[PDB]
Amino acid sequence: ASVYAWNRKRISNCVADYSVLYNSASFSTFKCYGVSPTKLNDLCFTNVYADSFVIRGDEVRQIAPGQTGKIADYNYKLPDDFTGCVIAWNSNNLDSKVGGNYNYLYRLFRKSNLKPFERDISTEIYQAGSTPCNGVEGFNCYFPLQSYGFQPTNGVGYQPYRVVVLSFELLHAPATVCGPKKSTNLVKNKCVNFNFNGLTGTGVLTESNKKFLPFQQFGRDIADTTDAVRDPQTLEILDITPCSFGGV
Amino acid sequence: QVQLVESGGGLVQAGGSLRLSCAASGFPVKNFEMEWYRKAPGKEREWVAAIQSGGVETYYADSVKGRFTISRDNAKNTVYLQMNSLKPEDTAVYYCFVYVGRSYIGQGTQVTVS
Amino acid sequence: AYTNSFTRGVYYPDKVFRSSVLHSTQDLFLPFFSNVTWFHAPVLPFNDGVYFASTEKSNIIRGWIFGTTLDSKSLLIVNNATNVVIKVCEFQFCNDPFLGVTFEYVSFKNLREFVFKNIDGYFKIYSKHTPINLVRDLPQGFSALEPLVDLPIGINITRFQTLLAAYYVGYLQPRTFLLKYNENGTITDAVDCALDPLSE
Numbered sequence A: 001a002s003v004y005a006w007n008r009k010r011i012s013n014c015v016a017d018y019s020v021l022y023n024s025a026s027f028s029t030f031k032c033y034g035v036s037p038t039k040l041n042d043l044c045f046t047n048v049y050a051d052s053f054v055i056r057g058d059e060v061r062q063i064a065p066g067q068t069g070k071i072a073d074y075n076y077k078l079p080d081d082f083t084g085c086v087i088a089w090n091s092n093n094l095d096s097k098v099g100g101n102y103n104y105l106y107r108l109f110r111k112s113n114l115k116p117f118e119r120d121i122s123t124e125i126y127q128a129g130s131t132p133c134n135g136v137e138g139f140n141c142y143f144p145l146q147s148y149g150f151q152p153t154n155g156v157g158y159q160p161y162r163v164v165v166l167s168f169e170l171l172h173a174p175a176t177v178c179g180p181k182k183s184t185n186l187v188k189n190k191c192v193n194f195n196f197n198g199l200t201g202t203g204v205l206t207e208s209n210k211k212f213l214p215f216q217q218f219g220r221d222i223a224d225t226t227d228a229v230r231d232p233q234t235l236e237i238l239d240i241t242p243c244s245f246g247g248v
Numbered sequence B: 001q002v003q004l005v006e007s008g009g010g011l012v013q014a015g016g017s018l019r020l021s022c023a024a025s026g027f028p029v030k031n032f033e034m035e036w037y038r039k040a041p042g043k044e045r046e047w048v049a050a051i052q053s054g055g056v057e058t059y060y061a062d063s064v065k066g067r068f069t070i071s072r073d074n075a076k077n078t079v080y081l082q083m084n085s086l087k088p089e090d091t092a093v094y095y096c097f098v099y100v101g102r103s104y105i106g107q108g109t110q111v112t113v114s
Numbered sequence C: 001a002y003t004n005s006f007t008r009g010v011y012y013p014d015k016v017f018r019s020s021v022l023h024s025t026q027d028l029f030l031p032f033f034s035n036v037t038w039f040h041a042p043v044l045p046f047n048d049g050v051y052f053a054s055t056e057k058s059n060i061i062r063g064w065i066f067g068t069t070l071d072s073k074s075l076l077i078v079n080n081a082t083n084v085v086i087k088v089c090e091f092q093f094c095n096d097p098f099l100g101v102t103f104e105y106v107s108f109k110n111l112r113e114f115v116f117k118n119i120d121g122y123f124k125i126y127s128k129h130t131p132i133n134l135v136r137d138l139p140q141g142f143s144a145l146e147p148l149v150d151l152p153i154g155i156n157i158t159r160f161q162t163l164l165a166a167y168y169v170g171y172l173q174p175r176t177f178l179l180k181y182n183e184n185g186t187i188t189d190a191v192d193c194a195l196d197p198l199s200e
């Protein structure tokens, strides 16, 4: 998508793994604000709306929480205390045709400053003098749709860094897309601590002899001590016994 | 506060040479990237040459490599644009560009090659 | 119209297996021997929860809409021929709303009763199947409603409206139950504590 039409796409209820993105051998000036880039995959947060653009890479450092300029004035603005990540990396081989890739024209003029996270779309030309333009372009019309010069012989500051906006907001909203959570193997017949799917604790973990309905995840008994669990990757039912203790 | 003007235009024939300039005020060109764009009749605006802000690497587009040369002077705060080996495809209106806070577009110069 | 709800509206409050114990709890519950609003086919309010106990031979009723204003100002929980569409979308209905014969999910001789519950931003889906035959009213049998799905919206829903051979609507308010779990892990009997002093 372009800067006039970067959509607020609601990709939800799936997983977008980020650990394959760090080993892409491509990322240049990636900076995840608020939270660290390392723990993006284990802990997640709601409002997982996504955006994309190839911004011209001369002023990537103008995009920051509380930093204005040209890109932060007329393209896309970040508010103070940003939770989320914008990842900038080059796109030299594919977003560069011969003779200039003029498939992404961009807004050069707006009357006011852009609101943070505002997708701006308009047709009308800039108002800078007092005389209105008659449709025919004159000396004070100032046609906002300028062309990025995207040629293969441009340098690294002139070539577009591709940016994706995985914006993170807080609402009364479902946390729909999170990263992957790794799992180890299963230990049996051992006084051991466990980290199952939601529930952790200590005990001796055995094979079962009971059965469940297809909707329970674990089970308790009289006076509510947890003595059962279901494992999620094996489709089996697993029992809990307390560890060996007593007096001497 | 940034004012850009263009000078050094004229009319040449096939096989001529010319020299353009862009005098600047209010910003240093050794801290920002200077670019040049042209505008031919019947065509859209396209980039000609640029100098990076470090001043080390200069770049030219696909049809204008090997013949054109852009150079800068830090003391006069003016960037010079050299024409060599001119063809009638280069008949255009030339502008200099910089992004210092906002973008500033000059009045341009006229270069006619025939 | 109104009719008596003999022993209906019980559900598992959580996903915890319990064997042969008489667990007691208090939650948002349908009272035993209450009167539901029977309609024979209608905006209905939503105080805290609804017990929905419709029967139809083919389920011509497929959609019912939650919201505060029920217009473009908010769920549309609708079924179709092979799927269901649920989404929170500000939408519309005309002066004669009917079906012409932020989520996605893929799904008389029938009695498909459901109960809906409202706490802590969460809305939960409970159901049973009931293959027995009675055309007059809701029957004398007993059934416990198992959970299906949970999803947060954080919206204070005030009323609803169903769309399309009858449906039954009752309401939920907190009292205390006793549940009779069996060996196989299902609820076989229930006691409303505040019904009569024998049950107290």
Ligand SMILES: *[C@@H]1O[C@H](CO)[C@@H](O[C@@H]2O[C@H](CO)[C@@H](O[C@@H]3O[C@H](CO)[C@@H](O)[C@H](O)[C@@H]3O)[C@H](O)[C@H]2NC(C)=O)[C@H](O)[C@H]1NC(C)=O
Pocket (backbone or CB within 6 Å): A232, A233, A234, A235
């Ligand atoms: C969660 O993931 C695990 C692993 O991806 C799934 O376990 C897999 O289950 C299938 C069916 O039970 C196994 O296929 C069978 O394998 C046996 C011998 O291994 C073979 O005799 C059969 O002919 C058949 O191919 C599969 O091997 C097993 N994978 C692993 C790595 O253990 C599990 O089903 C997933 N759970 C859900 C709910 O999808």
